[PDB]
Symmetry: D2
Subunit: 209 residues, 4 copies
Amino acid sequence: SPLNPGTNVARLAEQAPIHWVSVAQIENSLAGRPPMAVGFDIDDTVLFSSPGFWRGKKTFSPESEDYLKNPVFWEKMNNGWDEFSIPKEVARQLIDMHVRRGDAIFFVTGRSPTKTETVSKTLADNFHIPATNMNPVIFAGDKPGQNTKSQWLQDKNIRIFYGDSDNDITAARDVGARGIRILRASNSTYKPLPQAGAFGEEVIVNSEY
Amino acid sequence: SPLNPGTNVARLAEQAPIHWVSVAQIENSLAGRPPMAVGFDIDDTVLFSSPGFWRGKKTFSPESEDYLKNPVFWEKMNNGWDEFSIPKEVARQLIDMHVRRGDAIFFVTGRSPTKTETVSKTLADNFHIPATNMNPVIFAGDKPGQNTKSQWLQDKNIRIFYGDSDNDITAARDVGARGIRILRASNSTYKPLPQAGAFGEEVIVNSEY
Amino acid sequence: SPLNPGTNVARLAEQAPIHWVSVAQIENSLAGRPPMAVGFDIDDTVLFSSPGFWRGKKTFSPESEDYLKNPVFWEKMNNGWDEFSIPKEVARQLIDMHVRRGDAIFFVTGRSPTKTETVSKTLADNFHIPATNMNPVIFAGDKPGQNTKSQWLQDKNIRIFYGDSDNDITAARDVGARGIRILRASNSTYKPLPQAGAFGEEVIVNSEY
Amino acid sequence: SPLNPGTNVARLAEQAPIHWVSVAQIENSLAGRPPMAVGFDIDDTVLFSSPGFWRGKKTFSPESEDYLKNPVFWEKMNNGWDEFSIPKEVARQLIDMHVRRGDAIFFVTGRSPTKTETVSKTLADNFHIPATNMNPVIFAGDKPGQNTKSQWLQDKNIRIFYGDSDNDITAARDVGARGIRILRASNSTYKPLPQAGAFGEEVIVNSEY
Ligand SMILES: [Cl-]
Ligand SMILES: [Cl-]
Ligand SMILES: [Mg+2]
Ligand SMILES: [Mg+2]
Ligand SMILES: [Mg+2]
Ligand SMILES: [Mg+2]
Ligand SMILES: [Mg+2]
Ligand SMILES: [Mg+2]
């Protein structure tokens, strides 16, 4: 509010009590452990997919969140608009690390399911995921016949789950998996940004890009 | 390189010697001044347009920067792919402020020119720019018949030029205009990021989104 | 208040709109200018003098600020307790720069005046200030016969005044001198910390030590 | 080196991979646990004692570190110069928390031992430590008849050890105690600052003051 608010060195040096980690520290923590299943949220975790959601909002519901309940939007979103989604560097590093380990890589999303989807292909191509490590995207939710993110983590015996939202971390917590937080980019159109670290979970440094 | 690099409070509090400003401070600095021409770079200044450039690179030159010399790319980029570009909040605030002032708003881009372009329309629609304040995008460069960014600033008597690149700031400097820097987002695909403040220019706080 | 408050990347990257400068930038800004008078506040500007004020508070008024009105305290403070005051690196660099320029160096303090003082000697010795550049400490205030910081800046034609408090900056402002802010260290016992930059003034980077 | 180095938003948001904690999180982690022995380093952990070391250096060895081997210095340092040492807020909070728990509070220092010492009294008085929780300062080292910091932690069954130096953390590590790092203030005269977090240990947020 003030024109010249100023600052002080206590504020400049102030740190939130967050357990920050690096990809290297995560890899070290898994040293010796045999191949296992690991999981990733998609949106704002491995892909900056705001471009599609932004276009979707403008096209189908400029004045509300109704586009997210619109099957015409989801068809477009899941069948080509991820060509405009920008893969995150943190995800390249994590996926490379887990492939090097021989881990099974799963993607678990809350996106609404569609007749067909090319998201799995986009992910395998962009992250250079060998077919042997790759698994088709799981569309999780509370719709009839679906299973929740938590149930899927149990089902696939996923030991580590990476995600940007509170629900991603609590999904891991509910089933005894290690939930590791990725920072949502500040130019995401999905606001407010989550409070990374709100469950005392590990948060990956510099993971906004 | 070290697994546990650590830190110290000198590093935590360390500030680069940058002249940071707010939109409110810029507006205050213009108090009383009659309507004038102001200018904006487009990419990473008012639009996060990486989604289109990313798709362009993958489609036309996955292994080089050749797509930027490809007329087929520019046709797509300038005639619809900005529907996936995400308008920056800092730009909403600056444009609103300048419209409130009754200023003339110009956009000056180094994008290659095309037969037609719908970028001007995208900008007017997204930033709610009244027709009276709006001007068609200027495609500047060193191609025969073109004029440089600097020459256009002179031609239109642009008094303030906002941009994210070194060339934007030096364009303003060369003609005695006030060059004000916008931060390029860290998830931009245009790397390396510029050193904002490298010419002692004003840099807008929090302008990465 | 929350046990795990978390954070987000907007907050991590957030900058206050402050005009930060370096000693090198200040020196550059004075390139070519003939020798002139410059001035420095003492406490939390050139000396971390909290050790003496802390000891003074404990000894003379553990339950109030009364020690600051006590002549017995000021005698001790001004005649030897600065042997425990720690010279600030930013002050070493500024004083060296101004001595190199051939500038006259003044110190202007709001400390209560005493029969004798050895502060001037402490400052000349610690900052290696040549006798030709050195001037005895000015004890400024609103006591009968005293002059204010502002009046002294006028009297000595001080062109630049360095200080950590709001009153230092406004003293410079009132007389048309360039007021430049030094950050008060977060372990100072003089609290709350000032809002450096609250008058749109230049603030020296990393100047807390 | 450059006059206008600039910055970018990747650098502005960059975080070191540090396990930051708060006093509240430490207290929570000990919920339910019976009274136990805990330990604190003194210098730059609970006291900003640079004022005395600075005065000592100037008086006994202005041109070297020889003052630290001088018995005349240690007599002064350990028998009154801590009246100028400034207690750290983080230490007030930790000591209060541990006293509330009914824990035994130990101080373990590498300061050279002297005939008498009033440091224990300074600590009990300043931190309001009840006699029942207080223990005389342990002077640890590798001098004949002394025991090392590590040996003392073992001897007193100290379960948590707080300190600012690498040697403090490794002392705890060597005996299976929980070593928790405090940040050394940037205006300390003991340089270089340690790399807090260099052993993957917990580091207390904002603990420089
Ligand atoms: Cl960012
Ligand atoms: Cl600090
Ligand atoms: Mg997500
Ligand atoms: Mg970003
Ligand atoms: Mg640009
Ligand atoms: Mg002061
Ligand atoms: Mg220590
Ligand atoms: Mg400090």
